[PDB]
């Protein structure tokens, strides 16, 4: 299934990659690392397709906290760039409300005076 | 004689008649393991029976004989609607939810009936595939599928993991109705859900309702839990602006 | 029980509670033994005395009760884990 | 890449989309689209047809549970929305190798019939009678089959390779076009049950062919990367052959309003499926649209407007004439 997933990714069929990766999580049984990798892959393809709710649901199911934080960083950035700020407000971050403020502060101060919407 | 008279039946497929006879010849062969050169093995060659049907009937015979591994290996060999439901229900009755999931993932049977969709949801839930079961409920009947999802998550102890999901306003309204109706423990879970969603007014009003209903409750463990719940919410109530306190204290 | 009878009294009280809480957080960080041997040092154990002390702890109804609410949420999570 | 002129949201992925090519007696144009497990019938009205419409008025009329992924949709000529005797009839092919004929009164009477006999995937199907009594289908079993509405096989033509597209001739009675994957387009007479003629493509695989309704001498197709045009009876060789897509062309459809305009789609690809609208007088596409992942291509009956199905969306492109 990991081989067929690489093939479907190279052909550019993200809906089928999500379906197959969901089946492959069933076979991954006790390997939490493979489950983390497959769920990170499902998150990425849902995010790329603009399926914000399903991407958020996939992110909450990631067992690896390090990958979950990197997926959370990617979700926050992509939704901010797409101007989908309402969904981002609705999404219930756990103890990571100050990670968002720290990221936007790090970018804000790091970036030039010409404002956009990070400060807003 | 009663077996052979099946061949005289009109408007029956010949292969279905041969299927009953083959299934019967397998029972006879199994009754006599000690002679390898039985003329009985010539039956499929003598009546031009496809090797495909042979393996399928062997698979069904092995299933009724409690050899589920070799049964599935015969049926899955590369060489009906009611059979899908019965195979899945049989595998679930025996506790082998993993083989029921394997079967469902490979064969992908079309769930046409509310019974088949509830069956497929139960296979997915028994394998901890909650997100797939949840998506299947949304795809297929929405009140019945959500009811089945919430009842099975409550029976399996998965309600805390369900509360971590993203709900639509409709799914959320139905979850609130379900958790309000289904006992005092589910009203404490609904309180936790309101707190996790920053819905502090609804959490405080629900706790006032629970404070009024528990004035006669002996039980030591429920009394200690209600004491802790009351203390936490009385701390949140102190932090609220005077106006929000008034709105929370106005019945 | 701090009886900051005057303004600055309360000013300073707040200041100190704040700083102390920060320091305590940081210190507990590596506190009760990082569980390398356990599935990441889960805090299953809950102390009733800490919760009782928090209730009798006196400070402004805003930030202090918000911290109390966070502690209550943590206690609820611990109860869910026990369930 | 031009944005779509109009976009309509759908419940799920659109695998096939077909405008009703017939007159239904309504002011709106009927549209059918196939999802993973359903077929939706909708009415579309455009600002270009009625000045009271702002952009696109899209109304779902009926949803049919299919249970399988729909691969092709064919409208029946008997389809009418007239208030006196409304009749919806269409055929579908799906991944289960079956044809389903749906019949509806747009009220409570919803019937479907299953037709079995293809041993491979059905790639395309059409109604092949002016009266709408007969269905032609083609597939990976290397057959073209003719069915009555009763699901009885009337005729069968053995193909030399997988049948990839089938089309009824718009004016000439009894002429069926069948496009084979190896580049051969055959014409069959359904009265004599004989092959009349063939065309050959210079490129392979041949993926889709369509008749020009405005000029019944013209056939257009896609094979390999290129679009190919023939003009009959002048030659069995292509009149024109030009690049359509950088990586595999999938669908070809003639405009129903202009004999020089056609649309092509690229294969369900990593570079999001391109739609290219061509005009014969131009060496390059007149319009290049992007759909993230889209299947089905159909032209509006009257307007210079085409539709492609995509991820939970229908995309419409108006071509300036």
UniProtKB/Swiss-Prot annotation, chain B:
The lineage of its organism: Eukaryota, Metazoa, Chordata, Craniata, Vertebrata. It comes from the Eukaryota. It comes from Xenopus laevis. Interacts with the Nup107-160 subcomplex of the NPC. Required for the assembly of a functional nuclear pore complex (NPC) on the surface of chromosomes as nuclei form at the end of mitosis. May initiate NPC assembly by binding to chromatin and recruiting the Nup107-160 subcomplex, which may in turn recruit membrane vesicles containing pom121 and tmem48/ndc1. Association with chromatin may require the presence of the mcm2-mcm7 complex, suggesting a mechanism for coordination of nuclear assembly and the inactivation of replication licensing. This is Protein ELYS. Belongs to the ELYS family. Disulfide bonds: none annotated. The N-terminus forms a highly conserved seven-bladed beta propeller decorated with long loops and mediates anchorage to the Nup107-160 subcomplex of the nuclear pore, synergistically with the central alpha domain. The disordered C-terminus is responsible for the interactions with chromatin. It is found in: Nucleus, Nuclear pore complex; Cytoplasm; Nucleus, Nucleoplasm.
């Amino acid at each position: 299934y990991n081989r067929v997933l690489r093939l479907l990714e190279d052909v550019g069929l993200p809906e089928l990659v999500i379906q197959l990766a969901t089946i492959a999580i069933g076979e991954a049984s006790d390997d939490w690392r493979s489950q983390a990798a497959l769920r990170t892959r499902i998150f990425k393809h849902h995010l790329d397709m603009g399926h914000n709710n399903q991407a958020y649901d996939a992110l909450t199911q990631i067992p690896d906290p390090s990958r979950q934080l990197d997926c959370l960083r990617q979700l926050v950035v992509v939704l901010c760039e797409r101007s989908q700020l309402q969904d981002l407000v609705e999404f219930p971050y756990v103890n990571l409300h100050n990670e968002v403020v720290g990221i936007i502060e790090s970018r804000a101060r790091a970036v030039d005076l010409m404002t956009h919407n990070y400060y807003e | 004689h009663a077996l052979l008279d099946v061949y005289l039946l009109e408007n029956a497929d010949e292969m279905s008649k041969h299927a009953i006879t083959i299934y019967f010849l397998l029972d006879i062969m199994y009754s006599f393991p000690d002679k390898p050169d039985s003329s009985i093995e010539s039956f499929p060659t003598a009546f031009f029976v496809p090797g495909s049907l042979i393996k399928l009937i062997q698979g069904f015979w092995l299933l009724d004989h409690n050899d589920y591994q070799n049964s599935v290996d015969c049926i899955l060999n590369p060489a009906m609607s009611w059979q899908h439901s019965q195979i899945i229900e049989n595998l679930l009755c025996h506790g082998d939810s993993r083989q029921a999931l394997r079967y469902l993932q490979v064969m992908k049977p079309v769930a046409t009936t509310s019974k088949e969709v509830k069956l497929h949801m139960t296979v997915l839930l028994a394998n901890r595939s909650i997100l797939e079961a949840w998506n299947l409920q949304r795809l297929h009947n929405v009140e019945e599928l959500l009811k089945h999802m919430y009842e099975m998550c409550q029976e399996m102890g998965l309600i805390e993991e369900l509360l971590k999901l993203t709900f639509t306003d409709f799914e959320q309204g139905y979850l609130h109705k379900f958790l309000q109706t289904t006992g005092v423990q589910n009203q404490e879970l609904l309180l936790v859900h309101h707190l996790q969603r920053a819905n502090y007014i609804s959490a405080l009003q629900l706790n006032q309702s629970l404070k009024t209903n528990h004035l006669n409750d002996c039980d030591r463990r429920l009394r200690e839990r209600s004491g802790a719940r009351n203390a936490i919410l009385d701390q949140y109530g102190k932090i609220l602006p005077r106006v929000q306190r008034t709105l929370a204290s106005e019945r | 029980l701090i009886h900051c009878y005057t303004a600055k009294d309360r000013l300073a009280q707040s200041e100190m509670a704040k700083r102390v809480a920060n320091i305590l957080r940081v210190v507990l960080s590596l506190q009760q033994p990082p569980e390398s041997m356990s599935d990441s040092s889960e805090p299953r154990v809950p102390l009733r005395l800490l919760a009782p002390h928090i209730g009798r702890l006196p400070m402004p109804e805003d930030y202090a009760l918000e911290e109390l609410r966070g502690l209550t949420q943590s206690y609820l999570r611990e109860l869910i884990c026990d369930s | 890449a031009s944005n779509a002129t109009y976009t309509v949201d759908c419940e799920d992925y659109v695998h096939v989309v077909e405008f009703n090519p017939f007159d239904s007696g309504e002011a709106g144009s009927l549209l059918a689209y196939g999802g993973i497990s359903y077929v939706v019938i909708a009415s579309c009205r455009f600002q270009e047809e009625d000045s009271t419409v702002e952009g696109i008025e899209f109304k779902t009329l009926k949803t049919f549970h299919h249970g399988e992924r729909v691969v092709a949709i064919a409208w029946s000529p008997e389809t009418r929305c007239d208030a006196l005797l409304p009749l919806l009839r269409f055929a579908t092919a799906a991944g289960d190798k079956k044809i389903r004929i749906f019949t509806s009164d747009f009220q409570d009477k919803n019937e479907y019939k299953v037709i079995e006999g293809h041993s491979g995937y059905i790639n395309d199907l059409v109604f092949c009678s002016p009266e709408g009594t007969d269905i032609a289908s083609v597939g990976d079993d290397h057959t073209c089959r003719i069915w009555d509405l009763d699901g009885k096989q009337i005729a069968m033509f053995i193909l030399r390779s997988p049948g990839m597209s089938v089309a009824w001739h718009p004016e000439g009675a009894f002429k069926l076009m069948v496009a084979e994957k190896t580049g051969t387009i055959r014409f069959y007479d359904l009265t004599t049950h004989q092959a009349i003629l063939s065309l050959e493509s210079v490129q392979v695989p041949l993926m889709s062919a369509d008749w020009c309704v405005r000029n019944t001498l013209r056939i257009g197709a896609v094979a390999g990367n290129d679009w190919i045009i023939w003009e009959m009876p002048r030659s069995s060789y292509p009149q024109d052959n030009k690049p359509a897509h950088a990586d595999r062309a999938r669908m070809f459809r003639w405009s129903k309003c202009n004999e020089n305009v056609f649309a092509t789609t690229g294969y369900p690809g990593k570079m999001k499926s391109q739609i290219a609208i061509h005009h014969l007088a131009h060496p390059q596409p007149i319009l290049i649209g992007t759909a993230p992942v889209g299947s089905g291509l159909s032209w509006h009956r009257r307007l210079p407007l085409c539709v492609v199905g995509g991820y939970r969306k229908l995309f419409f492109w108006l071509t300036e004439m």
